[PDB]
Paper text:
Wzc, an integral cytoplasmic membrane tyrosine autokinase protein serves as the master regulator of the biosynthesis and export of many bacterial capsular polysaccharides and exopolysaccharides. Wzc comprises a large periplasmic domain, two transmembrane helices and a C-terminal cytoplasmic kinase domain with a tyrosine-rich tail. Wzc regulates polymerisation functions through cycling the formation and dissociation of an octameric complex, driven by changes in the phosphorylation status of the tyrosine-rich tail. E. coli Wzc serves a model for a wider family of polysaccharide co-polymerases.
Here, we report the characterisation of the structures WzcK540M2YE (Y718E, Y717E), WzcK540M3YE (Y718E, Y717E and Y715E) and WzcK540M3YE_N711Y (an additional N711Y mutation) corresponding to different phosphorylation states. One intermediate, 2pY which has Y713 at the active site, does not follow the YxY pattern, since position 711 is asparagine. Notably in the WzcK540M3YE structure the stretch of residues connecting the α23 to the active site is entirely disordered and molecular dynamics of 2pY showed this stretch of residues to be highly mobile. We show that it is binding of the i-2 tyrosine to the tyrosine pocket (where i is the number of the residue positioned at the kinase active site) orders the tail between the tyrosine at the active site and helix α23. The structural and MD data reported here confirm this hypothesis, showing that the tyrosine most stably positioned at the active site is the one immediately N-terminal to the phosphotyrosine (or the engineered Tyr-to-Glu mutation).
Author numbering:
A (entry chain A): 438 to 477
B (entry chain A): 535 to 704
C (entry chain H): 494 to 582
D (entry chain A): 17 to 64, 85 to 243
E (entry chain H): 195 to 243
Write the structure that this text describes.
């Protein structure tokens, strides 16, 4: 449990990619859509 | 950045706008790694390059998608000087001619952080939209791309997130 | 001792310089004349590299370009271009 | 930050957390079910002080006398090829065998490092067996003594299935004394009484 | 007992220096603080000497 928790914390604190259109809208960029992944 | 979804979004949007009875033209101005003709069913001769270099006319480049409903213009043969080809005035002549015969023209472009083709094309584009991958790209990269389009004289309308997945942390 | 924009036209640096060329084509509008001056803060920064490569990348698009090497103290443009060193600036 | 974020992250990475916890728990289960059991025996001595006796009990004199009496310098190990063969053999209900050895003397190579000579004895039947020291194969029989090639060996009452193998090492007297002293402990438990508790831990419940 | 060609430094150090060297690595402890047991310890590079 401890090693899983610390690994998850490391991964969370090392991610930098976008996660929601709120981040792009903060800067002043109009997010016109959000296309989900197509499993097909 | 490459492999973000420019071709996916552009082609699907062209299809969804063509199915509503409006004529659509799809130009694949990714003269470096474009594969639209592979995805559409192709007569790979006389692409965009063969027109820009002057060895083709404006009529042999346009083809019909089978299960689509919109025309398309593939890149054709990979040239050695793409960014120097795209500056030719024949490109603007092609766009001006096409704008009078179609209801919509959608141009796919390479990334802007990698090459400068997008910023050359963006002068004649009425609207410009960026595509941002969900987890790969960053806010910093998108802001840099916006500012690099601003410097070159192209006003970006907005962004389009892509590759979204449902996360419980939201 | 040859132009990067000529020996290896598909290098990353030449792509960045083409981006700079497209930026300039819009920045250099409404200027009082068509003269560009590339300068710097400290020597060995890249003034000659950037200026020469930019001149090449703007010449390859069918526009006539003149390149003046006003570095009257340690300039070596004639060495990099192939020279008749008589009658300089 | 807030609790909602951390709960969401935990829910998102549930698969990784479960996998890591499961593999660690599996390793713990394997170790706890394969480790050789260690039994503990004890005794109580009445002293008619107790600090000098505590120091004298663990002296090399008494332990050496005990080792000479019980021939603890002849180490016999049942052979399993892997690091887990013994554990699985115990789990499968296999009965461990044993050999009673009363006399052993190896040629005592005594090189720079390996001061402990050793041989390998393979069980062929209830009566005879094979001996190999460095690939030299010899045949011996329980009962009659073996004195060949500078090797003297006596075997009594070998109890194992045929095909079993055993490492027989003649470790030095000092090493045996150190091994015995390492697992042997003495305590007073009263700090003034004549009561001394002696504890010995080992893997053979009767030995 | 050595192979031919070996060399050895032979020093006649003074008695006091030898005593100091021996005393430096030699230790005594009681280990019981009241018993008659004394533990003597000597550390050196020659296992038999
Ligand atoms: N929402 C999506 N769902 C599933 N696949 C996608 C999605 N978006 C893009 N792709 C696929 O991932 C690959 C990269 O997209 P593509 O636009 O073709 O490359 P690029 O962005 O460099 O032009 C493609 O094969 C595409 O089919
Ligand atoms: N992006 C670059 N990549 C590789 N070499 C470079 C780059 N920029 C400058 N240089 C090289 O480093 C040296 C210094 O640049 P240069 O412009 O000629 O000197 P200065 O700035 O003093 O006029 C040159 O030899 C140049 O070729
Ligand atoms: Mg593409
Ligand atoms: Mg210079």
């Amino acid at each position: 449990l401890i090693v899983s928790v610390v690994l998850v914390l490391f991964q969370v604190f090392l991610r930098r990619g976008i996660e929601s259109p709120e981040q792009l809208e903060e800067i002043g960029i109009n997010v016109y859509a959000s296309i989900p992944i197509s499993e097909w | 950045s490459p492999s973000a979804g420019m071709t996916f979004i552009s082609s699907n949007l062209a299809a969804t706008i063509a199915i509503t009875g409006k004529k659509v033209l799809f130009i694949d101005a990714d003269l470096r790694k474009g594969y639209a003709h592979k995805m559409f069913g192709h007569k790979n001769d006389k692409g965009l390059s063969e027109f820009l270099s002057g060895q083709a006319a404006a009529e042999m480049i346009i083809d019909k998608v089978e299960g689509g409903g919109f025309d398309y213009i593939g890149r054709g043969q990979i040239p050695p000087n793409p960014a120097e080809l795209l500056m030719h005035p024949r490109f603007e002549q092609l766009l001006n001619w096409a704008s009078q015969n179609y209801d919509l023209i959608i141009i796919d472009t390479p990334p802007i952080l990698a090459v400068t083709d997008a910023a050359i094309i963006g002068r004649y584009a009425g609207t410009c939209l960026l595509v941002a991958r969900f987890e790969k790209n960053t806010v910093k990269e998108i802001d840099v791309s916006m500012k690099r389009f601003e410097q070159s004289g192209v006003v970006v309308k907005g962004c389009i997130l892509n590759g979204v997945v449902k996360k419980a942390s939201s | 001792d040859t132009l990067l924009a000529v020996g290896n036209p598909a290098d990353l640096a030449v792509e960045a310089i083409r981006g700079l060329r497209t930026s300039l084509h819009f920045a250099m509008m409404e200027a009082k004349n068509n003269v560009l001056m590339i300068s710097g803060a400290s020597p060995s920064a890249g003034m000659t590299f950037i200026s020469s490569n930019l001149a090449a990348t703007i010449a390859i698009t069918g526009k006539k370009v003149l390149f003046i090497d006003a570095d009257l103290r340690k300039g070596y443009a004639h060495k990099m271009f192939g020279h008749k060193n008589d009658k300089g600036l | 930050i807030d609790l909602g974020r951390v709960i969401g992250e935990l829910i998102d990475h549930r698969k990784l957390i479960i996998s890591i916890t499961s593999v660690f728990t599996l390793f713990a289960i394997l170790y706890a079910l394969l480790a050789t059991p260690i039994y503990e025996t004890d005794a109580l001595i009445q002293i008619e002080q107790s600090a000098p006796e505590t120091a004298l009990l663990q002296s090399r004199m008494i332990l050496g006398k005990t080792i000479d009496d019980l021939n603890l310098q002849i180490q016999i190990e049942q052979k399993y090829f892997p690091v887990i063969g013994r554990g699985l053999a115990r789990l499968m209900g296999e009965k461990p065998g044993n050999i009673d050895i009363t006399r052993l003397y190896l040629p005592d190579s005594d090189d720079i490092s390996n001061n402990t000579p050793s041989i390998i004895l393979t069980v062929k039947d209830k009566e005879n067996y094979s001996i190999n020291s460095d690939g030299i194969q010899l045949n011996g029989v329980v009962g009659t003594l073996l004195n060949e090639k500078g090797i003297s060996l006596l075997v009594n009452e070998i109890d194992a299935k045929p095909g079993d193998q055993f490492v027989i090492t003649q470790l030095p007297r000092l090493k045996a004394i150190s091994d015995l002293l390492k697992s042997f402990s003495v305590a007073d438990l009263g700090k003034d009484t004549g009561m001394l508790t002696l504890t010995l831990t080992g893997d053979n419940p009767k030995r």
